[PDB]
Amino acid sequence: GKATDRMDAFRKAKNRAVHHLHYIERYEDHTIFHDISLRFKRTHIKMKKQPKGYGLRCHRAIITICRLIGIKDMYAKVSGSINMLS
């Protein structure tokens, strides 16, 4: 969301996001199906499927997004650049 006032950018960002929803399949509704190793531009994310109780042991931005998806047990390490948007 881009605006001159914060509250006007929260609105735009918040409302525009619900029109761009992914569906993230979860294994047993707590983790991911396999382990994911991806590189977006210069950011590397190595995500690991874990059992239950493990919890979200991952970058503070990933735990936030995982809580919004429904993933409850996972590990991820971010390498390379750590641009929040990448």
Binding site: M7, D8, F10, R11
Partner: peptide
């Protein structure tokens, strides 16, 4: 939850 002030966007009665 941070409640953002709701702007009265449609001030001008169309």
């Amino acid at each position: 939850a941070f409640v953002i002030p709701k702007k009265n966007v449609p001030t001008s009665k169309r």
